[PDB]
Design a protein around this ligand. Sequence first.
Ligand SMILES: O=C1Cc2cc(Nc3nc(Cl)ncc3Br)ccc2N1
Ligand SMILES: O=C1Cc2cc(Nc3nc(Cl)ncc3Br)ccc2N1
Ligand SMILES: [Cl-]
Ligand SMILES: [Cl-]
Lengths: 124, 124, 4, 4
Amino acid sequence: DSCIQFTRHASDVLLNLNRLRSRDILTDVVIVVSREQFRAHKTVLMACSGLFYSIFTDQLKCNLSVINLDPEINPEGFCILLDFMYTSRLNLREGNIMAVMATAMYLQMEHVVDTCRKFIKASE
Amino acid sequence: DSCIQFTRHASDVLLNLNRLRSRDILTDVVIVVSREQFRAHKTVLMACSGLFYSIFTDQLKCNLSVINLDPEINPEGFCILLDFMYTSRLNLREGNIMAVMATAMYLQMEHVVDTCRKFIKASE
Amino acid sequence: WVIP
Amino acid sequence: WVIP
Ligand SMILES: O=C1Cc2cc(Nc3nc(Cl)ncc3Br)ccc2N1
Ligand SMILES: O=C1Cc2cc(Nc3nc(Cl)ncc3Br)ccc2N1
Ligand SMILES: [Cl-]
Ligand SMILES: [Cl-]
């Protein structure tokens, strides 16, 4: 086509979706990770995670307002990944890299798994 | 912070949100523009438009499944802008620029209004 | 704005 | 991935 493109549009959209998350506006699901609860937008979770994409396209699970993750999932690892989904920024640290990678594998977040594997390979 | 950032994340999220739109997955509102209907995600509309942000943060309108636009709004202009919201690409043409700019002013899409004004100023 |  |  003969379209023009606004370079910053996708980043501005994501910034606004994160603002809605921060103010709890139009969040439509709670993700339960053991004793912790995380409110989010189903569409953003699906756009970032192969696991959430599969969950919310299921004819029954699409209507659930609460999703319980596997008890092996670390709440901090999930928190770091949820922040990444809404910001593109990943808080990867020596102390959290193992939990973050395990959570990204479970959530099916391929690019996150890739950088975790590379950061681990560099420190061995 | 000491975060790392994935450059393509925001664009990949938007691409996935557009895929959900194309398959009518988790769309939660119909925008009526005269005889035409456009299904969308409230969160994406709010993230792109000052008008939709104001509408869906209203304690009553946030719960509406149908939103009727002003009858002066051109369905093609709205269609072009809805595509822009989900893709960052604007199909701006001599034949549609006036309708697109008028629709972007009504929807409060400042960057779109700006490029329309510049493209119009160049042709005068 | 750019030519994509 | 980059240093933002
Ligand atoms: O690592 C990742 C990230 C991700 C996101 C989605 N999400 C969607 N995929 C498709 Cl094809 N259409 C719409 C949506 Br929402 C699927 C798989 C994966 N794997
Ligand atoms: O030209 C534009 C595009 C746009 C988008 C929004 N959307 C939001 N704004 C804020 Cl501050 N927080 C969350 C959201 Br969603 C507001 C105003 C405008 N004007
Ligand atoms: Cl990822
Ligand atoms: Cl805009």
